[PDB]
Design a protein around this ligand. Sequence first.
Ligand SMILES: O=P(O)(O)O[C@@H]1[C@H](O)[C@H](O)[C@@H](OP(=O)(O)O)[C@H](OP(=O)(O)O)[C@H]1O
Length: 284
Amino acid sequence: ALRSYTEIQQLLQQGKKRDVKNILRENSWPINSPIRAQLWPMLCGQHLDGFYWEMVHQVFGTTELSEKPIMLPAFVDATHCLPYHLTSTGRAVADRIVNVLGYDCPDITYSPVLYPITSILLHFMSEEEAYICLAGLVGSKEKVFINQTKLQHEVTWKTVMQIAKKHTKSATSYFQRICPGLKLERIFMDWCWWILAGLPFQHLVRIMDCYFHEGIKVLYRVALVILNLFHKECQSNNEWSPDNIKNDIGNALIKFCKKIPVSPAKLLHAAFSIRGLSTQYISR
Ligand SMILES: O=P(O)(O)O[C@@H]1[C@H](O)[C@H](O)[C@@H](OP(=O)(O)O)[C@H](OP(=O)(O)O)[C@H]1O
């Protein structure tokens, strides 16, 4: 039997965050489960009743959703406004949310992650609830969820690079070998896109479950796992032989993720097996 929303909400009010953290890690609620409509707005909230629509009005002058394609704020990665399974109306709603966010949060200058997440939220809750999740995450003062400046963006992928150099040293050494002269920076600049634009939606959802509770470290972990799985795969295999991937390891990783050979649960099992990732270690 799987855990339920009200169970977790109780534990949360009591303050058993490790218990909640572990439930989220091990409970693989199906893709259709109604729990996320309730589970996710709470998780995001843990870190104004009609405030959203006020913002909506001030920007667009109306509550009514446009059919005209909406112009996105410059902080979005135009190449990565990943819609996933959102309908045409779903995308238009996403466009409205990020416009509102850009309007109310002027310090967000570069956040290629913000739109893909907005789309994910919209798969399980309403437009206003998605917003309130996002504003919670972005405004988090302790935990980090969504990078908002280009400086933060680059410190982050450099951090991930540093972590990968030790925890998946074989994979990175393997990259340098098959591709001499290659600077690993070019590869890790796109680390989040392995997850957000590679892994199947099914895998993303389970990842979001833990991510909305723990933060960006969950994403760090999954990045390591993908790198290990990709190196293992490269050792004996169809298309991921050195000759086909040396040309572009970058999208070789993306292609590999789209056809990732492990279940969401087996993927998540590896990530949390990884030890030593102290929060102030990654600050060093
Ligand atoms: O014991 P290990 O093997 O070193 O593993 C980590 C360690 O226990 C830290 O206390 C903790 O980091 P922080 O509490 O400082 O974030 C992290 O929690 P986590 O699994 O929730 O990330 C653990 O994974």
